[PDB]
Ligand binder design. Sequence first.
Ligand SMILES: [Zn+2]
Ligand SMILES: [Zn+2]
Ligand SMILES: [Zn+2]
Ligand SMILES: [Zn+2]
Lengths: 481, 162, 481
Amino acid sequence: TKGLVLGIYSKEDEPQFTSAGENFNKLVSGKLREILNISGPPLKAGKTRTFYGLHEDFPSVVVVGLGKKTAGIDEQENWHEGKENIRAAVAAGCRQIQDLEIPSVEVDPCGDAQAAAEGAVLGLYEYDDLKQKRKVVVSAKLHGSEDQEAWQRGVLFASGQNLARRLMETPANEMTPTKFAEIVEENLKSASIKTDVFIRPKSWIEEQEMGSFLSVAKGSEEPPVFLEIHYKGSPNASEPPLVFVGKGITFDSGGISIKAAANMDLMRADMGGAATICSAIVSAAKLDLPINIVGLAPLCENMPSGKANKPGDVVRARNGKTIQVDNTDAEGRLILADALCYAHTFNPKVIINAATLTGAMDIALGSGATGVFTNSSWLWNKLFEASIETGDRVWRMPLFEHYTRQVIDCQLADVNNIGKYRSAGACTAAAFLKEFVTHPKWAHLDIAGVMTNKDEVPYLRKGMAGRPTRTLIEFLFRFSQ
Amino acid sequence: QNLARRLMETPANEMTPTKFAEIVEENLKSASIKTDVFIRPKSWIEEQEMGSFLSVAKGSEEPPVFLEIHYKGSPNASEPPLVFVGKGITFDSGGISIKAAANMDLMRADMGGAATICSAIVSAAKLDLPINIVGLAPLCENMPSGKANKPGDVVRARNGKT
Amino acid sequence: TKGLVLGIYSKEDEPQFTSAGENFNKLVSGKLREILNISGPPLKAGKTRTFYGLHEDFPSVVVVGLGKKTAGIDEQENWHEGKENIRAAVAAGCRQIQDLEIPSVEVDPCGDAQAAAEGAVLGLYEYDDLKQKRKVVVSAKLHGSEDQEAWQRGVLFASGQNLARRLMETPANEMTPTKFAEIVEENLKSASIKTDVFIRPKSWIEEQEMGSFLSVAKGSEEPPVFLEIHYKGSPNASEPPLVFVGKGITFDSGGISIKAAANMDLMRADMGGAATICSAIVSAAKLDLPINIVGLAPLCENMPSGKANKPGDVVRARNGKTIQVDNTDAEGRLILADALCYAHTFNPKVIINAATLTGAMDIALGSGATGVFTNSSWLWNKLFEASIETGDRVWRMPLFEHYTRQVIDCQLADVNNIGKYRSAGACTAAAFLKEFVTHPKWAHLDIAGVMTNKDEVPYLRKGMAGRPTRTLIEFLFRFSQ
Ligand SMILES: [Zn+2]
Ligand SMILES: [Zn+2]
Ligand SMILES: [Zn+2]
Ligand SMILES: [Zn+2]
């Protein structure tokens, strides 16, 4: 009927199976173990082998490599390695059932039903929607009935990611400042009726003295929308919130300080900051987490025109500070100078903000870890531990005065959107945003190196990554618990 | 000088083709009541067959203003003048033949020509110098857009030359 | 006769003095306190004011701002801030005595006689030697007689730095692979007779199957020298050592994969890795630290010629691994593939290596902190704590498999001197070097962002920085103790 992803570890006396496959072997009377011997060398990590006709109702059975049974937290990779073995491994497996065009598949729990589900679901995702030429659409259910809410936690966590991924990936002519707001509101509302959405327009933004956000919007003839998300998780609604903030440029052409044509099509995912955090709130509502969260996202586009933002311009942020706009591509910093100010209105506990802010971050760590600068070691630890579980690493970076200094000197104004020099790129951009924040537990996450995947993360196919949505969701689960 | 300097230095979103004209007129008028100002608009410019000036203005959605300054310094007003002229791009991005981002913020001072000479007339009025001077300055911006000036284009200057 | 740098803090009832200046006030009978009132607003951090004729033997008296008395370790700047106040502050002071052309100056201990001496000495340094037009040469002694071995520890620590600085700064036609070896040997030998030097030549290198180091040397007609330093610090000479390794390109032109002319004159300090660590061993010998240290440094130049290293070339490192040399500017990685292998010969405890390795590090942190990747959290902590004392910060970076992977795939060979992509620049370069190391406590310090100073570090004038020589020296003091 349908396919099966089964698993095996690496040697003891005979390389063992995850019990479900030990059990499926008994079932086809040793003929799985036996054909695996006949096939060739053993299956190391995330390597795959397909065995036809072993079972009457499982014509294709893919056995995938899970590595060492007792693989655990790694001091060097700063993750739980087991989970990582299982994700790459059942992603691998699920992508094999899928090339065989088997529309459904049952997955071996592999000792961690959540890693299995985060592998099967992140593993299989594409964004097929505008290609009339699509791969088969395969339904992936758990094999078994024992470990069900952890597999659904995998499906949940990986699905919150695939949403950031679709929200990122879609061409920015479809994915506008209005359409993103609309899908996020429909997604947050299906998640919890204990929610409110506000797709606030230019009049409200104008009214909110958001000059910096608004200066950025004006080049395009596409409407700005400041989005406001509310999740009423706590028992007493009056609990102070945890506010997520995120930059939402639907398309970044650089503006007058215009980008080069080389691969500029990826700028459609410069709204990755707004996508990431939104998908993460949708998931804590889906999880129905005992915390009140607020989601904030400036949405607009960065375009050249007869009325675009010019180099040398002093605009005013909500908080009275003026910014010299010396480079029109440094606009996420400006979009975020106002949504960050508005975050203090809400009286929060933690203000996590996220943004595909600078390529220098990409030069720095470049898809290994997502750089997070925070004036809070508590907050750092909190993020870093979630990174170990989820596997979507996060690395700390310096919010030293050293850097505020280069952005704080300014010919016309109070702050300047770029620093005096080329060096320390992600650090000057983060020390510019510190100027718009006075809350003690603040964290900037620069998502610009983890924007994309190719081969680096296994269980993620080539394209927009939606990183770090699960670390973020894992942080709010641990914080709620 | 410090007036040309402030008139140069101010970010070109504040220092427009209209705001420069306005500060220069207030400065020239405080200097001497023996003055006249004309912050002539696009209709006058159109009328003055200023196709070349006007082609430049069209990329931006910011208004052109041709500024005209008069200082009546001489005893006999009929003395022929000394005319100062000066380029007043409030911001230069290069247009379609667009500049590189490296330090382009300084293009706010591409109206330095109009600033320099204006500040100089304001001072000869402040000095109340026995000469009639006339100040002339095209003000506009150079921007890329759906209706910006394209490469290869023949426009016509007031004098018939293309 | 001579000048005086005195100090004052920020308000209580009347902004207090460092006791020496309270004492110098009593001495000119309140007329220092009194003229400070008459002068204007109070002196905040590292700001300066000169008072002539207060004393008969102190014609110019500079009072410098020390900030808050109780300024201490900062959780955000990750340093001892007091020390930092005092360095910038008596550097400031000493540079004022010096423009007045007063050839000598007495310095206020300022509560930490070492920070005062590290400020006066780093503060005043230039490299005047090839200018017939030089500033005055001012002798800076302590004011007082109470706290003498800590001031001499400042003078020692700052002088080990100014040596890395002179060793960096000198034009690479003077500072050759032979001349560096010669000054280091004269400096290490004046420091301790319990030392040995080996300025090993091309024949020895050839003999040591150092194909990678040697491939790099061949473009130039300037001799390679592999330098070997020995400090016999321990009681039992048989104690295993702590081996420092460091890249010593006297000049880097990129080779065939040739650099652009823009500011290429700074490549004379691509031997900053060899300078840094050498200056640090010279200082632990000067300190006579109860540890055996070994200093290792490939010295050579990177030049284009009829026999330079070409793009696409497989050369062999001492350890059997082959490297595809796809970019001739990635040569520090190659120079270090062999000196790192040779480090395991010595049976070490810690292998600290240091190198002006990549500009991407400069894009990353860029003179804030010196990036240190280490497979040793112990080693990381050890370095990071020294950074807090000295003020010369050090930031951890990721030695994740993620990065080994991009350098480990290779068309012709085993490893490749550059990675498949532009991203994660310092991380691929550090994960390439991990391939030449099998010791548990290894640490790569990429010095390329801290190569230079301008205004960022106060007590250091514009030019080669000699960073992090004091963090390094402080680590060996703490390790010996
Ligand atoms: Zn941009
Ligand atoms: Zn952007
Ligand atoms: Zn190089
Ligand atoms: Zn080099």
